[PDB]
Amino acid sequence: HMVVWPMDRTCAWALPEQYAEFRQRATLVPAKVWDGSPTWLVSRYEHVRALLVDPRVTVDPTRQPRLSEADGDGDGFRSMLMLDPPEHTRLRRMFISAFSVRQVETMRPEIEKIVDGILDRLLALEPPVDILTHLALPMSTQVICHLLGVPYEDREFFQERSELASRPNDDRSMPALIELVEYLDGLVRTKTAHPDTGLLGTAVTERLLKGEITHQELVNNAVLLLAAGHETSANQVTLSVLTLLRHPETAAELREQPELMPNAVDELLRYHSIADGLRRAATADIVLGDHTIRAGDGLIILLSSANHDGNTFGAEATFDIHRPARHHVAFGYGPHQCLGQNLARLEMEVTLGKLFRRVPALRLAQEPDALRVRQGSPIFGIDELLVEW
Ligand code: HEM
Ligand SMILES: CC[C@H]1OC(=O)/C=C/[C@H](C)[C@@H](O[C@@H]2O[C@H](C)C[C@H](N(C)C)[C@H]2O)[C@@H](C)C[C@@H](C)[C@H](O)/C=C/C=C/[C@@H]1C
């Protein structure tokens, strides 16, 4: 225990200075955590990847070192994201085909129509406008509600609850988590009696009414699909508008060459690495070069630091939309690698694409060293991003 964890980011785009020294090392950095349990931080691309696919690393919440007084296992609440193979595998198998490349590519039309209407609505407003509230959150939310069949009318309730649920060191995360489960509990009971199409109702029909999945399991993974599905993209899109605004050439080059967008999106994902500080524990000894991780040791997986690893990515702190960037780990790696990632990328490609095609002189409406940054959550972002045109 040298540096304390959790560490919060301080800048909308800078990673913490410490991370780069962490990578210059021969060991893993030890960290002091609320419960005094042995815990390493993991900073190198080589390492992050090795451990995330290793079979002796667990997500079991009871093995993770406790990071605060409010941090806990959630009273037996488990999504697939909190299970190891083979139980993990059974649950992810039921949801996977909805998310394949070619399957996700069939939603492009509905995503385009969706973002079209948000932009019409947004451009009707007197600027300056906030991107998170008027572009990023509306699209991620509508898109996830369409895929899942969750009512958009409910979005104020589940948005605010997801935000709070995803703060594991905050008092309010438990009641919000309880309420979200309760909301999906009612929704799944409804869909059970009246299956719709859309991912939840299709799983009622094919898995739940066929004996492949229980009621609590569907409910729990529905919380996960709902919250992951909007809160993440919302922040990635917001931060990305900032970054493109911060590098004007990039906005205009994309606007003038859309075939450059997919790699640009991957570069935005790498650069910001908004999902960070993943929690794992060793279940057996694990040899990583010089260092021997011991049965029971906690691990804090820094996707961001690995995405900014100099030994893998040249000029790591630079935003560069021409570096092949497909091999970043913004969506993790290994069994739990983001089930949504093709949907995330499509959403971004269409949202950023249409926004700068339409508001081609979009400008920052505030100075980007007065941005509030989100702290205390494994999903980074900024509270607000004001723009003019
Ligand atoms: C930019 C957007 C997103 C980023 C950066 C992101 C990142 C990640 C990361 C890092 C993980 C792994 C966490 C871990 O191993 O502990 C993950 C898992 C997950 N993501 Fe995402 N994600 C995004 C969007 C989405 C979207 C749109 C969906 C749609 C529902 C989604 C669904 C999931 C699911 C279900 C998992 C759990 C997979 C499993 O445990 O097998 N994600 N994501
Ligand atoms: C790293 C990004 C993932 O962040 C995540 O995986 C986000 C995980 C959030 C933290 C977890 O919330 C914490 O859960 C604990 C078990 C209890 C804890 N509180 C009550 C002490 C609660 O905050 C999850 C369970 C919140 C659910 C709303 C939810 O499924 C969130 C899933 C989000 C997925 C993101 C992909």
Swiss-Prot record:
Residue runs in coiled coils: none
Record's signal peptide: none
Cofactors that this protein relies on: heme
First-tier enzyme category under EC: oxidoreductase
Pathway assignment: Antibiotic biosynthesis; mycinamicin biosynthesis
Gene3D superfamilies: Cytochrome P450 (1.10.630.10)
GO process annotations (BP): antibiotic biosynthetic process
A Pfam family assignment: p450
EC number: 1.14.-.-
Binding site for heme: 88, 92, 280, 336, 338
Effects seen without this gene: Cells lacking this gene accumulate protomycinolide IV and mycinamicin VIII.
Source species, domain of life: Bacteria
GO molecular function: heme binding; iron ion binding; monooxygenase activity; oxidoreductase activity, acting on paired donors, with incorporation or reduction of molecular oxygen
UniProt xrefs under InterPro entries: Cyt_P450, Cyt_P450_B, Cyt_P450_CS, Cyt_P450_sf
Family that this chain belongs to: Belongs to the cytochrome P450 family.
Function in brief: Involved in the biosynthesis of mycinamicin, a 16-membered macrolide antibiotic. Catalyzes hydroxylation at the C21 methyl group of mycinamicin VIII, the earliest macrolide form in the postpolyketide synthase tailoring pathway, leading to mycinamicin VII. Uses ferredoxin MycCII in electron transfer for catalysis.
Protein name: Mycinamicin VIII C21 methyl hydroxylase
Source species of the chain: Micromonospora griseorubida
Lineage of source species: Bacteria, Bacillati, Actinomycetota, Actinomycetes, Micromonosporales
